[PDB]
Design an enzyme around this catalytic site. Structure first.
Site, PDB file in Angstrom:
ATOM      1  N   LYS A 101     -37.562  83.058   2.447  1.00 33.19           N
ATOM      2  CA  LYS A 101     -37.590  81.656   2.890  1.00 33.19           C
ATOM      3  C   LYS A 101     -36.278  81.303   3.550  1.00 33.19           C
ATOM      4  O   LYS A 101     -35.249  81.873   3.225  1.00 33.19           O
ATOM      5  CB  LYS A 101     -37.789  80.654   1.742  1.00 33.19           C
ATOM      6  CG  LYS A 101     -38.666  81.099   0.636  1.00 33.19           C
ATOM      7  CD  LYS A 101     -38.361  80.222  -0.583  1.00 33.19           C
ATOM      8  CE  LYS A 101     -39.192  78.969  -0.531  1.00 33.19           C
ATOM      9  NZ  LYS A 101     -40.626  79.342  -0.674  1.00 33.19           N
ATOM     10  N   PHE A 102     -36.291  80.322   4.436  1.00 28.71           N
ATOM     11  CA  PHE A 102     -35.067  79.930   5.095  1.00 28.71           C
ATOM     12  C   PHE A 102     -34.354  78.918   4.219  1.00 28.71           C
ATOM     13  O   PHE A 102     -34.916  77.881   3.877  1.00 28.71           O
ATOM     14  CB  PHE A 102     -35.349  79.357   6.481  1.00 28.71           C
ATOM     15  CG  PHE A 102     -34.115  79.208   7.311  1.00 28.71           C
ATOM     16  CD1 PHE A 102     -33.376  78.042   7.279  1.00 28.71           C
ATOM     17  CD2 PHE A 102     -33.671  80.263   8.111  1.00 28.71           C
ATOM     18  CE1 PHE A 102     -32.231  77.930   8.029  1.00 28.71           C
ATOM     19  CE2 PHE A 102     -32.534  80.132   8.880  1.00 28.71           C
ATOM     20  CZ  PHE A 102     -31.816  78.977   8.837  1.00 28.71           C
ATOM     21  N   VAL A 103     -33.134  79.234   3.814  1.00 30.15           N
ATOM     22  CA  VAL A 103     -32.390  78.368   2.920  1.00 30.15           C
ATOM     23  C   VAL A 103     -31.127  77.889   3.629  1.00 30.15           C
ATOM     24  O   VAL A 103     -30.656  78.543   4.551  1.00 30.15           O
ATOM     25  CB  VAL A 103     -32.035  79.105   1.633  1.00 30.15           C
ATOM     26  CG1 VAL A 103     -33.320  79.557   0.925  1.00 30.15           C
ATOM     27  CG2 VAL A 103     -31.118  80.323   1.956  1.00 30.15           C
ATOM     28  N   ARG A 119     -23.930  72.883   6.246  1.00 35.78           N
ATOM     29  CA  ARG A 119     -22.845  73.655   5.612  1.00 35.78           C
ATOM     30  C   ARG A 119     -22.121  72.756   4.576  1.00 35.78           C
ATOM     31  O   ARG A 119     -21.683  73.273   3.558  1.00 35.78           O
ATOM     32  CB  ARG A 119     -21.835  74.212   6.603  1.00 35.78           C
ATOM     33  CG  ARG A 119     -22.443  75.080   7.676  1.00 35.78           C
ATOM     34  CD  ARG A 119     -21.399  75.955   8.315  1.00 35.78           C
ATOM     35  NE  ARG A 119     -21.837  76.509   9.589  1.00 35.78           N
ATOM     36  CZ  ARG A 119     -22.368  77.721   9.737  1.00 35.78           C
ATOM     37  NH1 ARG A 119     -22.560  78.481   8.668  1.00 35.78           N
ATOM     38  NH2 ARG A 119     -22.713  78.170  10.943  1.00 35.78           N
ATOM     39  N   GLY A 141     -30.322  93.366   7.168  1.00 40.12           N
ATOM     40  CA  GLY A 141     -29.204  94.252   6.855  1.00 40.12           C
ATOM     41  C   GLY A 141     -28.588  94.931   8.066  1.00 40.12           C
ATOM     42  O   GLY A 141     -27.655  95.735   7.933  1.00 40.12           O
ATOM     43  N   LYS A 142     -29.082  94.594   9.258  1.00 40.18           N
ATOM     44  CA  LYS A 142     -28.603  95.257  10.464  1.00 40.18           C
ATOM     45  C   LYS A 142     -27.146  94.909  10.729  1.00 40.18           C
ATOM     46  O   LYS A 142     -26.362  95.744  11.179  1.00 40.18           O
ATOM     47  CB  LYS A 142     -29.480  94.903  11.668  1.00 40.18           C
ATOM     48  CG  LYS A 142     -30.956  95.256  11.445  1.00 40.18           C
ATOM     49  CD  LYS A 142     -31.768  95.238  12.744  1.00 40.18           C
ATOM     50  CE  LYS A 142     -33.156  95.866  12.527  1.00 40.18           C
ATOM     51  NZ  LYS A 142     -33.115  97.057  11.599  1.00 40.18           N
ATOM     52  N   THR A 143     -26.782  93.674  10.421  1.00 40.83           N
ATOM     53  CA  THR A 143     -25.426  93.204  10.631  1.00 40.83           C
ATOM     54  C   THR A 143     -24.419  93.962   9.772  1.00 40.83           C
ATOM     55  O   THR A 143     -23.357  94.396  10.257  1.00 40.83           O
ATOM     56  CB  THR A 143     -25.325  91.703  10.321  1.00 40.83           C
ATOM     57  OG1 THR A 143     -26.269  90.977  11.142  1.00 40.83           O
ATOM     58  CG2 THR A 143     -23.915  91.244  10.572  1.00 40.83           C
ATOM     59  N   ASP A 183     -30.367  89.881   5.313  1.00 40.06           N
ATOM     60  CA  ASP A 183     -31.784  89.713   5.563  1.00 40.06           C
ATOM     61  C   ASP A 183     -32.291  91.066   6.020  1.00 40.06           C
ATOM     62  O   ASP A 183     -32.698  91.865   5.179  1.00 40.06           O
ATOM     63  CB  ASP A 183     -32.013  88.615   6.581  1.00 40.06           C
ATOM     64  CG  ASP A 183     -33.470  88.386   6.896  1.00 40.06           C
ATOM     65  OD1 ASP A 183     -34.342  88.872   6.166  1.00 40.06           O
ATOM     66  OD2 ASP A 183     -33.751  87.719   7.901  1.00 40.06           O
ATOM     67  N   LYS A 192     -19.354  82.179   9.982  1.00 38.63           N
ATOM     68  CA  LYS A 192     -18.851  81.016   9.236  1.00 38.63           C
ATOM     69  C   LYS A 192     -19.464  80.941   7.841  1.00 38.63           C
ATOM     70  O   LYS A 192     -18.827  80.470   6.894  1.00 38.63           O
ATOM     71  CB  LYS A 192     -19.151  79.680   9.978  1.00 38.63           C
ATOM     72  CG  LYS A 192     -18.556  79.493  11.379  1.00 38.63           C
ATOM     73  CD  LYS A 192     -19.079  78.194  11.978  1.00 38.63           C
ATOM     74  CE  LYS A 192     -18.598  77.965  13.388  1.00 38.63           C
ATOM     75  NZ  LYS A 192     -19.041  76.583  13.803  1.00 38.63           N
ATOM     76  N   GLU A 203     -20.103  88.282   2.479  1.00 38.95           N
ATOM     77  CA  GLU A 203     -21.171  87.765   3.326  1.00 38.95           C
ATOM     78  C   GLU A 203     -21.993  86.684   2.593  1.00 38.95           C
ATOM     79  O   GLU A 203     -22.046  86.668   1.361  1.00 38.95           O
ATOM     80  CB  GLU A 203     -22.061  88.956   3.771  1.00 38.95           C
ATOM     81  CG  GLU A 203     -23.143  88.738   4.809  1.00 38.95           C
ATOM     82  CD  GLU A 203     -22.638  88.235   6.142  1.00 38.95           C
ATOM     83  OE1 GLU A 203     -22.221  87.073   6.188  1.00 38.95           O
ATOM     84  OE2 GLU A 203     -22.686  88.957   7.165  1.00 38.95           O
ATOM     85  N   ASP A 204     -22.598  85.762   3.343  1.00 37.96           N
ATOM     86  CA  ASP A 204     -23.474  84.748   2.747  1.00 37.96           C
ATOM     87  C   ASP A 204     -24.848  85.372   2.458  1.00 37.96           C
ATOM     88  O   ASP A 204     -25.406  85.161   1.390  1.00 37.96           O
ATOM     89  CB  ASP A 204     -23.629  83.500   3.652  1.00 37.96           C
ATOM     90  CG  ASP A 204     -23.985  83.842   5.108  1.00 37.96           C
ATOM     91  OD1 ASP A 204     -23.875  85.012   5.475  1.00 37.96           O
ATOM     92  OD2 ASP A 204     -24.369  82.928   5.898  1.00 37.96           O
TER      93      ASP A 204
HETATM   94  N1  WPG Z   1     -28.958  79.440   6.861  1.00 39.42           N
HETATM   95  C1  WPG Z   1     -29.646  80.647   6.785  1.00 39.42           C
HETATM   96  N2  WPG Z   1     -29.268  81.681   7.543  1.00 39.42           N
HETATM   97  C2  WPG Z   1     -29.956  82.872   7.480  1.00 39.42           C
HETATM   98  C3  WPG Z   1     -31.030  82.989   6.634  1.00 39.42           C
HETATM   99  N3  WPG Z   1     -31.536  84.257   6.761  1.00 39.42           N
HETATM  100  C4  WPG Z   1     -30.770  84.874   7.653  1.00 39.42           C
HETATM  101  N4  WPG Z   1     -29.859  84.059   8.091  1.00 39.42           N
HETATM  102  C5  WPG Z   1     -28.820  84.275   9.058  1.00 39.42           C
HETATM  103  C6  WPG Z   1     -28.644  83.411  10.232  1.00 39.42           C
HETATM  104  N5  WPG Z   1     -27.404  83.998  10.692  1.00 39.42           N
HETATM  105  C7  WPG Z   1     -26.352  83.251  11.331  1.00 39.42           C
HETATM  106  O1  WPG Z   1     -26.525  82.067  11.533  1.00 39.42           O
HETATM  107  C8  WPG Z   1     -25.085  83.928  11.758  1.00 39.42           C
HETATM  108  C9  WPG Z   1     -23.963  82.994  12.058  1.00 39.42           C
HETATM  109  P1  WPG Z   1     -23.241  81.955  10.747  1.00 39.42           P
HETATM  110  O2  WPG Z   1     -22.653  82.811   9.595  1.00 39.42           O
HETATM  111  O3  WPG Z   1     -24.074  80.829  10.282  1.00 39.42           O
HETATM  112  O4  WPG Z   1     -22.046  81.362  11.365  1.00 39.42           O
HETATM  113  C10 WPG Z   1     -27.416  85.418  10.353  1.00 39.42           C
HETATM  114  C11 WPG Z   1     -28.553  85.669   9.478  1.00 39.42           C
HETATM  115  O5  WPG Z   1     -28.119  86.432   8.422  1.00 39.42           O
HETATM  116  C12 WPG Z   1     -28.576  87.731   8.232  1.00 39.42           C
HETATM  117  C13 WPG Z   1     -28.030  88.828   9.088  1.00 39.42           C
HETATM  118  O6  WPG Z   1     -28.102  88.457  10.364  1.00 39.42           O
HETATM  119  P2  WPG Z   1     -28.942  90.415   8.953  1.00 39.42           P
HETATM  120  O7  WPG Z   1     -28.922  90.884   7.552  1.00 39.42           O
HETATM  121  O8  WPG Z   1     -28.306  91.365   9.775  1.00 39.42           O
HETATM  122  O9  WPG Z   1     -30.341  90.200   9.387  1.00 39.42           O
HETATM  123  C14 WPG Z   1     -31.390  81.877   5.837  1.00 39.42           C
HETATM  124  O10 WPG Z   1     -32.404  81.938   4.968  1.00 39.42           O
HETATM  125  N6  WPG Z   1     -30.665  80.756   5.956  1.00 39.42           N
HETATM  126 MG    MG Z   2     -23.663  85.839   7.235  1.00 41.57          MG
HETATM  127 MG    MG Z   3     -26.098  80.319  10.661  1.00 35.24          MG
END
Ligand code: WPG
Ligand code: MG
Ligand code: MG
Ligand code: WPG
Ligand code: WPG
Ligand code: WPG
Ligand code: MG
Ligand code: MG
Ligand code: MG
Ligand code: MG
Ligand code: MG
Ligand code: MG
Lengths: 208, 204, 197, 207
Positions: free
Chosen positions: A176-178, A190, A130-132, A128, A69, A124-125
């Protein structure tokens, strides 16, 4: 101007902004610590990425694939800037769109045979580890696109990273978690235009 | 101090990260305040302005030429509030160039009894606004307030501070977002710093 | 040449209740006549027409105050968008005039107006500007009225060709009111009496 | 209570040459039917209507992919603008579903997530209204606090089963339209205006 770039580099010690300088949703007043990346700055950077994308990929039909999402806002805005270019220029190219969500298992989306021979832009948003992306690329390539590139709003500097780098990057951020701009914490935040950092009380409030 | 504080050592951004008019490509050094950040801050100022001034008819006065972009954007955000709230107030507008002599506006009797909002691009020494305020008070506005996109930290300040401030910035010459260098760089969305070859090219 | 978006004499406009309207004008407007978004869409196309025709030499954009100020700001925003996303770009400077212009000499002058009715104001303005030895002069007007009072002047760029009706909004005023309104609209009987001079 | 902006059967639309149009669709479109900016203006007002009716409790906003994604993004942007400039606001969460032929739902969170919530379904167009009836019947098995439907477009058509959504952008003639994420065989989603296809375009992009 150049099309490959590490993005806007946000340093480790970036303090961000006091929430009181900006218009912030009331229901998140106490849940956020700082604004980290203002919405407007994201828009400015995304405008330039759209130009970079058309320069690299504008030579053939583009399929833009939104990773749901959290990719949805970046996807919508990136594509709006690409459309602005395509209706104000000499040349343009058709673009179709699709949406996938990851469980990695790919959910929804068209048959991936529709990617064959197309210029595929994965949106992509955040990257992190990069495995995805690596698993997702490895999938997509099996359908023999004419090319596959990845645009990510955010790339984290993290010791858990594997070396994967996307083709188009909005911002390179510290570890950092954003949240915000469709990036969530347990589905919250969101509905926030800026990228921000969560307060400990916000983390506690929306904890699963 | 009450706006967004940009520090003396602010490095700004590389031009190559943004969309920049080709004809200024060699002429700018860095992006200093991105356009979108100006917009986000201006949104919040619009709300601040309505909170303090929205009780009575507002007369918004744009100080040309540099004030024109901030003015149009600030007033757009105020209109957006007013068409989406339970209550609002009429606003009329005027334009002046700069007793201090005021060029090109309505008779200043239009200010009498109104909530007057003066809109500037930048406050530096603060003398212009001090002098303009001294004149405006003689027309007996209900209130007078000043919104300035930028305020400089300068030792040449006469101590005047505006009521509404976008950004507090260093004592450095900036251009963009309708701020010019010899009439150039107004046609630029971002606030930026000029390069050496830029200064030389457009020097009057 | 494009005559603009032609709005018919019988154009009904839109119900105010379908749009976001400032509360302080809720009783003062009859209908929305041209939605703000349609104005933006048309202006985006005009910016491209302007840059194709004038974008070979430095442009001075001249805003006719007060009424041209919204159209001017938006039109220049769309031209700036073109200029930072293309290979082709040209410096632009700006000036304002209300109804010295050394700012004009040897440059491509674009005059920006809210509305042409009789065309007499613009012919008078054009006669003055010519004296500053511009390289080129062209005129963009958001609105042009269909009217037998016209003296035949037609602008180079036109947003909308409208009926011989009094409109307000998007910086077009009635005794200085309704400039703070995004849409172009028709005034109600209550509004006409309330803000009458 | 609003039927939306009524676009009549004889409305001629606008000459393409009056707008900015992507060149790859120049021969493929007949007329601009609803300019992008008019969609924006109407969507602004809808966002306020939605907050007036639904703003008392957490909203789950459900995007019906693919065609609803633009309306959805814009409508939520206008709602966010209200929420950051008001004293009164409520959280929103989001989800995305795809419908596939009756219909089944694809993707989405568990529908249990909708229980006790104010649910806003966001759709591009209602024609017969059978699709929305189906989705509502499914959603209603999970006992949401309320459920409402916002559709950008509603067709005037004899084939309507009589379903009316709660928020409507535009009520249009029975004409096949494209743009603003509405497609013809996946084309024309990359067009900001709503437009009518030319016979040429129908033949070029026909499956
Ligand atoms: N809000 C936030 N989300 C983050 C953050 N770092 C990672 N993530 C991710 C948490 N994620 C999700 O919640 C997936 C479902 P969504 O798109 O919200 O429906 C995936 C993470 O993203 C990175 C990839 O997994 P990867 O590159 O493979 O390690 C962060 O700093 N803030
Ligand atoms: Mg994503
Ligand atoms: Mg998420
Ligand atoms: N582009 C730029 N312009 C600046 C800068 N600091 C000051 N100024 C101003 C130069 N000014 C003008 O050019 C006036 C005419 P204009 O608005 O361009 O049509 C006025 C200066 O603003 C400050 C006031 O004079 P004061 O508070 O009384 O010292 C700057 O860092 N960049
Ligand atoms: N709000 C409105 N104003 C209108 C309208 N038709 C004309 N006008 C104009 C009235 N005008 C002004 O108020 C000038 C001062 P301002 O720009 O508001 O600071 C000029 C009129 O524009 C046409 C030229 O005069 P001309 O072509 O020479 O006849 C109208 O349908 N609505
Ligand atoms: N581009 C266009 N699409 C249309 C039009 N009328 C219907 N439709 C829809 C054809 N549809 C799809 O293509 C679904 C897949 P998508 O959302 O594009 O990924 C469904 C139709 O919408 C109406 C509902 O089916 P219902 O209310 O149950 O009759 C139209 O005038 N233009
Ligand atoms: Mg100034
Ligand atoms: Mg100056
Ligand atoms: Mg005029
Ligand atoms: Mg007037
Ligand atoms: Mg649908
Ligand atoms: Mg479809």
């Amino acid at each position: 101007m150049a099309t490959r770039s590490p993005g806007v580099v946000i340093s480790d010690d970036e303090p961000g902004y006091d929430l009181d300088l900006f218009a912030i949703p009331n229901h998140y007043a106490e849940d956020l610590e700082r604004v980290f990346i203002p919405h407007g700055l994201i828009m400015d950077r995304t405008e330039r990425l759209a130009r970079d994308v058309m320069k690299e990929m504008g030579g053939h039909h583009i399929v833009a694939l939104c990773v749901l999402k959290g990719g949805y806002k970046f996807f919508a805005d990136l594509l709006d800037y690409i459309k602005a270019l395509n209706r104000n220029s000499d040349r343009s190219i058709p673009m179709t769109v699709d949406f996938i969500r990851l469980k990695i298992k790919v959910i929804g989306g068209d048959d991936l045979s529709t990617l064959t021979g197309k210029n595929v832009l994965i949106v992509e948003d955040i990257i992190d580890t990069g495995k995805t992306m690596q698993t997702l690329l490895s999938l997509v390539r099996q359908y023999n696109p004419k090319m596959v590139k990845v645009a990510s709003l955010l790339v984290k500097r993290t010791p858990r990273s594997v070396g994967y780098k996307p083709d188009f990057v909005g911002f390179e951020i510290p570890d950092k978690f954003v949240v915000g701009y469709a990036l969530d914490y347990n589905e919250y935040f969101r509905d926030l235009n800026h990228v921000a950092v969560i307060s400990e009380t916000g983390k506690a409030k929306y904890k699963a």
